[model samples]
Target chain A: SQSRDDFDRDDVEQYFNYMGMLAVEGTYSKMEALLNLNIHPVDILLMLAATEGDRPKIEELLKAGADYSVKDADGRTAIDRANSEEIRDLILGY
Target chain B: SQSRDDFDRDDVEQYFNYMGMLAVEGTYSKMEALLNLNIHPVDILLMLAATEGDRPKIEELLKAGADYSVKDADGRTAIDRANSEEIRDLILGY
Candidate 1:
């Protein structure tokens, strides 16, 4: 390791990216803080929330510009994962 | 992707472990919160702080049962990497 050694820009970014993951796990406020710092990958976190089916989180992410169209490894989309009509409708708005 | 379906215990623990990584990177407060939730791996976080040479984090982890011996895949411990005499001294006390 390093001493009181400084972290380079890339090093700092790597740290921030991990913080973004922390936000997706359970701390929405952390994501919001990262967003305020302009350090978040909005789409990744949105997908994470969608994957977990967190409705409030999905809505929050949608409002935060997380409504991008994203395909999957199997060429599927969120609409295909939305088990409910309203959920599909919400995704359709994106 | 699961629905608003609850996370299994293992799933939750996995998420919490990632949060522990986040804490080691730059968010010690997150580690403290996880500790309050009883989800932190004290020794692991301690090792991470040692790698970063974050004196405060090392001291904090030390207070939280973070002094256990941990050898990585290379069978190397923190003492082998601490570049500073002060840091080496700190690890020696453990």
Candidate 2:
């Protein structure tokens, strides 16, 4: 079972990443709405890059201080949910 | 803003639907685990049908009493997040 703090953080992260997914998938109006929500852009960007299978993007995000363990909308960490095996290995190699 | 009752219901529904998605996408071990959790099979099947773009499956689920308004892992209704335009329209046609 997750603690309350973990659950709250995870839920908020999921919400932000889901919005990021909407932005990545061409929900432009929602993208604008997402920026207005004041969620951390790096968190959202990392999710976008993870789903896009862009390994270098993940590297850049890490360089910018993104946490690989930040759960996605599906509640899996970047390493757990990455669509690219290469990207998944990269996260694991971190 | 959603009420607490709505949030809890939505959150639990999302969790179950996410599990359903995992099952649909080839997570066979998790699929068995999901059945053990005892969530309503109709709810899980409706999510799977919605994501799979199977209109006939959705029809069957509806006939068997699935609720289209039940939110998914991303907090969207079956109609709202459906990958298929046909599925979306079908839900709306309901």
Candidate 3:
């Protein structure tokens, strides 16, 4: 049972880390899985996307009901942390 | 003189961190400035690019004289640690 709990915890962390990194890295399939999972928080995913300037993915996440204004530990919103003109344009267009 | 060395070290770290994050985040101007600086190692930038899956930027850094085979602290080359198909294509295309 302890091992089972550890496995479950690892699985959750993996899901969170994988989705967060995928959102930032702009992996469309991974992002889609996050959307379909329905258990992962959209805010965290959006924050990761903002950090990486993945605007299109951010937009898609938003369109799927992800909140764009969520702040991460850095006290920055998804739009606030966008680092590129292209990503900024995408965020603004949303 | 101590403070001066500290400042210089901080500057180097900042430059490294900034350019590394920019390559990952796809900030073209920041990347361009890093390219023009000629002070930082292109290998480090390439590694960061590979980590972030920035294909176009990785190519540009390579064309600007980055060595893709250089290993990092983890003994992984720029191409070795790339996490996605896009970045793998970029590294192979180089």
Candidate 4:
């Protein structure tokens, strides 16, 4: 039998983008709810955090199991996208 | 048993971003290959096309079955993101 996903592509895309919007808006609790829901991939959250230099979000996502080594579409990892030295160190150490 | 997908989150994110990169670079064939692979969802390609006002790409992606009604991270559909009136019409009619 073929395997499947509970969340379809639309669901994934919707949740992913919503998470990004929430992150940009600094709406952490709601984003955290989505994060905990596990509908969207968390690594992108880490990438977004690194790009925004949001240390708190980065740490939150890391605690939620965001991978630092995962590469984005440009083949740059979250570490490479880090806007601040503190973010770089946090990701590097995580 | 629980259902699962063949491509993991990393694969999805990687391919999705690569498609965006290729689209931005106007590398159609390579982007088309990834599209044909059925890895990343094609709706995003439509979104990217509308964003760049690339009529040919928008047409090609539509031909490849991209949904014009699909929303982006910003909750905007491809038609809403269309940079040109022609692009908007194409998406609207498709």
Give chain A TM for each model in order. Answer: 0.45, 0.53, 0.49, 0.55
Which digits, one per residue and each the tens of the lDDT, describe model 3 over residues A1-94? 1221222223323433454465545544433443344323555555556667766657766676656665544456667867777776676676
Give the higher-TM-score candidate: 1 or 3: 3
Which candidate ranks first by lDDT, i.e. highest? 4
TM-scores of all candidate predictions against the true structure? 0.30, 0.35, 0.32, 0.31
- For residue A15, what is the lDDT in candidate 3? 35
Please write out the lDDT profile of model 1 over residues A24-57, one tens digit for every residue. Answer: 5645443344334432355445544555555775
Model 4 chain B poorest ten-residue lDDT run: B1-10
Candidate 4's residue-wise lDDT over A1-94, tens digit each?
A: 1112232456434534543454335433433443454444667667666876878767767766777877655567789989988879988886
- Model 3 misplaced regions, further than 4 Å: A1-94, B1-40
CA displacement after TM-score superposition, residue B83 of candidate 2 (Å): 0.5
DockQ of 3: 0.02
Model 3, residue B28: what's the lDDT?
38
- Report the lDDT of model 4 for residue B11: 47
**Which residue pairs overlap in candidate 3's backbone?**
none
> RMSD to native for every prediction?
15.0, 19.4, 20.9, 17.2
Error of 2 at A9 (Å): 30
Interface RMSD for model 2 amounts to 21.5
Error of 2 at B89 (Å): 1.4
Instruction: Supply candidate 4's per-residue lDDT for B72.
Output: 50
